[PDB]
Enzyme design. Structure first.
Site, PDB file in Angstrom:
ATOM      1  N   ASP A 193      47.088 -16.868  17.164  1.00  0.00           N
ATOM      2  CA  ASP A 193      47.201 -15.772  18.080  1.00  0.00           C
ATOM      3  C   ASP A 193      45.805 -14.846  18.017  1.00  0.00           C
ATOM      4  OD1 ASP A 193      49.156 -14.803  15.922  1.00  0.00           O
ATOM      5  OD2 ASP A 193      48.755 -13.190  16.971  1.00  0.00           O
ATOM      6  N   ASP A 195      44.699 -10.676  18.662  1.00  0.00           N
ATOM      7  CA  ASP A 195      45.266  -9.456  18.851  1.00  0.00           C
ATOM      8  C   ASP A 195      44.277  -8.447  19.256  1.00  0.00           C
ATOM      9  OD1 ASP A 195      47.925 -10.251  18.066  1.00  0.00           O
ATOM     10  OD2 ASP A 195      46.752 -10.557  16.088  1.00  0.00           O
ATOM     11  N   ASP A 249      47.622 -10.655  22.453  1.00  0.00           N
ATOM     12  CA  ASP A 249      48.326  -9.434  22.506  1.00  0.00           C
ATOM     13  C   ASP A 249      47.203  -8.456  22.867  1.00  0.00           C
ATOM     14  OD1 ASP A 249      50.639 -10.639  21.632  1.00  0.00           O
ATOM     15  OD2 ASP A 249      50.401 -10.408  19.612  1.00  0.00           O
TER      16      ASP A 249
HETATM   17 MN   LIG Z   1      49.592 -11.571  18.000  1.00  0.00          MN
HETATM   18 MN   LIG Z   2      48.247 -12.139  15.278  1.00  0.00          MN
END
Ligand SMILES: [Mn+2]
Ligand SMILES: [Mn+2]
Ligand SMILES: [Mn+2]
Ligand SMILES: [Mn+2]
Ligand SMILES: [Mn+2]
Ligand SMILES: [Mn+2]
Ligand code: NA
Length: 325
Positions: A193, A195, A249
DNA sequence: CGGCATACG
DNA sequence: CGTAG
DNA sequence: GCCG
């Protein structure tokens, strides 16, 4: 060796990879059973090994290390003697562990949901797909995109995502900045992921920013899923002749809080839990990703940098690449 | 023995 | 309940 | 599971 992970440098790569990975299996399995205490101990013991300057070769070398008692020491002894630990291997091949790991890795599914599904007899992703009636919108998205979300995100992917986020942020609020956080900021070359932390140098101008950013990304066709100050999205990232789903995110913080939010969102998870534990138990201060509170004088510490925060806690500064606890 | 980090969506 | 680090 |  200090007892808290925030008191010691922990690099991304180290000299006890196999030992730490075995202990982290037992930590994960403890979590799947709801034993947060055992999870923490095994996580801390693993992290101690990550911080050591050379390989553990002999059991004697564990003496005096924090978080190594009878259980974690036995695990290491068996790996030193046989190259495998029977308890670890039993966990690895257990249907409970495999299924809890498969289910909890779905975006939208936590330990409690996975546990209930396991008790209901469910074992596979196609088991979950056969009864969509039992799924949240978030879980349906996590299941539809599960294959892409299991594929490593590369640094080249990150740079492309950051440019598109910056373009939407620049239209939402001129002067706003985008900072890469999480595991990529700690030096990881891959991740699952991405961020980003968004702020603006004029305190208060960030208010209302995230809806404006999200609306702009959505209008560009980049948002496969989204649901304020934190947005947990799935982005459509272009790829050679195609695209793939990527978890992104987006977080907004006023510039007064930005050092605390940077610290928290840069992690690691264990490092932040240990840092907050140290703050409260050793210094009597309450830390989170918004600030650092003195509950005796009832005041918040003003910070202009991560360096400020480490100083106010009496800790030697650690750059992000040494926070890989 | 109690504690185990602490938030937001 | 989920999410984050 | 370990610490203090
Ligand atoms: Mn994340
Ligand atoms: Mn992360
Ligand atoms: Mn033996
Ligand atoms: Mn807030
Ligand atoms: Mn007890
Ligand atoms: Mn917080
Ligand atoms: Na999950």
């Amino acid at each position: 060796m200090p007892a808290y992970a925030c008191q010691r440098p922990t690099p991304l790569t180290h000299h006890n990879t196999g030992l730490s990975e075995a202990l982290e299996i037992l930590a994960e399995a403890a979590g799947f059973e709801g034993s947060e205490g055992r999870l923490l101990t095994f996580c801390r013991a693993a992290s101690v090994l990550k911080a050591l300057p050379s390989p553990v070769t002999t059991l004697s070398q564990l003496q005096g290390l924090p978080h190594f008692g009878e259980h974690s020491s036995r695990v290491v002894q068996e790996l030193l003697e046989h190259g495998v630990c029977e308890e670890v291997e039993r966990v690895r091949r257990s249907e409970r562990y495999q299924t809890m790991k498969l289910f909890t890795q779905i975006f939208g599914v936590g330990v409690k949901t996975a546990d209930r599904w396991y008790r209901e007899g469910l074992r596979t992703l196609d088991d979950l797909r056969e009864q969509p009636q039992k799924l949240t919108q978030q879980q349906k998205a996590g299941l539809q995109h599960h294959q892409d979300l299991s594929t490593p995100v590369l640094r080249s992917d990150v740079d492309a995502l950051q440019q598109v986020v910056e373009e939407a942020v620049g239209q939402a609020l001129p002067g706003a900045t985008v900072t890469l956080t999480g595991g990529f900021r700690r030096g990881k070359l891959q991740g699952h992921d991405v961020d980003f932390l968004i702020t603006h140098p004029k305190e208060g101008q960030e208010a209302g920013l995230l809806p404006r950013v999200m609306c702009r990304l959505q209008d560009q066709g980049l948002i496969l899923y989204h649901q304020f100050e934190r947005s947990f999205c799935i982005f459509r990232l272009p790829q050679p002749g195609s695209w793939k789903a990527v978890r992104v995110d987006l977080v907004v913080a006023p510039v007064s809080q930005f050092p605390f939010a940077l610290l928290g969102w840069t992690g690691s998870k264990l490092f932040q839990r240990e840092l907050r534990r140290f703050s409260r138990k050793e210094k009597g201060l309450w830390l989170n990703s918004h600030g650092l509170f003195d509950p005796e004088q009832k005041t918040f510490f003003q910070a202009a940098s991560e360096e400020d925060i480490f100083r106010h806690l009496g800790l030697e500064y650690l750059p992000p690449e040494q926070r890989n606890a």
